[PDB]
């Protein structure tokens, strides 16, 4: 209910994949890619490998990546948080993995409810670009490989 009144990602919290409560105002001052992920998707490999490459190249510029597992799209994230974390480790992920959520419907995580009304998530690996103030500045559909985002990043760093 309160989620509708927010003006920034930084007003939200979320549990990371280890169960730790994360205040997302820890991302104030950083440019973030927020994405819903899945391990059993036809585009799992290209998305994970390109997000890892983006993080390796741009973390020192202030890029952060927040990955939210979601089983709502073809049941393509059926495992536990522990299994999903092991899976992401296999792609060398050192960005931020969160606990599995819903992104659509009444049960959607409040951050995702909020992002979607900024001026339904269609499938796995939708991406939002978040500026240093926590505002949504762009979104990218499931068919947009993460490298599509690269040209947009330098103007928000």
UniProtKB/Swiss-Prot annotation:
GO cellular component terms given for this protein: cytosol; extracellular exosome; mitochondrion; nuclear envelope; nucleus; protein-containing complex
Taxonomy, superkingdom: Eukaryota
Keyword Glycoprotein listed: no
Keywords: Cytoplasm, Developmental protein, Dwarfism, Lipid metabolism, Mitochondrion, Oxidoreductase, Peroxidase, Phosphoprotein, Selenocysteine, Transit peptide
Modified positions (Phosphoserine) in chain numbering: 8
EC code(s) of this entry: 1.11.1.12, 1.11.1.9
Signal sequence residues: none
GO molecular function, one term: phospholipid-hydroperoxide glutathione peroxidase activity
Active site: 41
EC category: oxidoreductase
Catalyzed chemical reaction(s): a hydroperoxy polyunsaturated fatty acid + 2 glutathione = a hydroxy polyunsaturated fatty acid + glutathione disulfide + H2O; 2 glutathione + H2O2 = glutathione disulfide + 2 H2O; tert-butyl hydroperoxide + 2 glutathione = tert-butanol + glutathione disulfide + H2O; cumene hydroperoxide + 2 glutathione = 2-phenylpropan-2-ol + glutathione disulfide + H2O
GO biological processes: apoptotic process; arachidonate metabolic process; cerebellum development; chromatin organization; dendrite development; lipoxygenase pathway; long-chain fatty acid biosynthetic process; multicellular organism growth
Keyword Lipid metabolism: yes
Tissue expression notes: Present primarily in testis. Expressed in platelets (at protein level).
Disease: Spondylometaphyseal dysplasia, Sedaghatian type: A form of spondylometaphyseal dysplasia, a group of short stature disorders distinguished by abnormalities in the vertebrae and the metaphyses of the tubular bones. SMDS is a neonatal lethal form characterized by severe metaphyseal chondrodysplasia with mild limb shortening, platyspondyly, cardiac conduction defects, and central nervous system abnormalities.
Main function: Essential antioxidant peroxidase that directly reduces phospholipid hydroperoxide even if they are incorporated in membranes and lipoproteins. Can also reduce cholesterol hydroperoxide and thymine hydroperoxide. Plays a key role in protecting cells from oxidative damage by preventing membrane lipid peroxidation. Required to prevent cells from ferroptosis, a non-apoptotic cell death resulting from an iron-dependent accumulation of lipid reactive oxygen species.
Assembly mode: Monomer. Has a tendency to form higher mass oligomers. Interacts with FUNDC1; this interaction promotes GPX4 recruitment into mitochondria through TOM/TIM complex where it is degraded by mitophagy.
Similarity comment: family membership: Belongs to the glutathione peroxidase family.
Protein name: Phospholipid hydroperoxide glutathione peroxidase GPX4
Species lineage: Eukaryota, Metazoa, Chordata, Craniata, Vertebrata
Gene behind the chain: GPX4
Whole-protein coverage range: 33 to 197 of 197
């Amino acid at each position: 209910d309160d989620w509708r009144c927010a003006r920034s990602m930084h007003e939200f919290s979320a549990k990371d994949i280890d169960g730790h409560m994360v205040n997302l105002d820890k991302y104030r001052g950083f440019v973030c890619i927020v994405t819903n992920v899945a391990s059993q998707c036809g585009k799992t490999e290209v998305n994970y490998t390109q997000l890892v490459d983006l993080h390796a190249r741009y973390a020192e510029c202030g890029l952060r990546i927040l990955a939210f597992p979601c089983n709502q799209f073809g049941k393509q994230e059926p495992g536990s948080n522990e299994e999903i974390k092991e899976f992401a480790a296999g792609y060398n992920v050192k960005f931020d993995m969160f606990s599995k959520i819903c992104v659509n419907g009444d049960d959607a995580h409040p951050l995702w409810k909020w992002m979607k009304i900024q001026p339904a998530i269609k499938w796995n690996f939708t991406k939002f670009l978040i500026d240093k103030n926590g505002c949504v500045v762009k979104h990218y559909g499931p068919m947009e490989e993460p490298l599509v985002i690269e040209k947009d990043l330098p103007h928000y760093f």
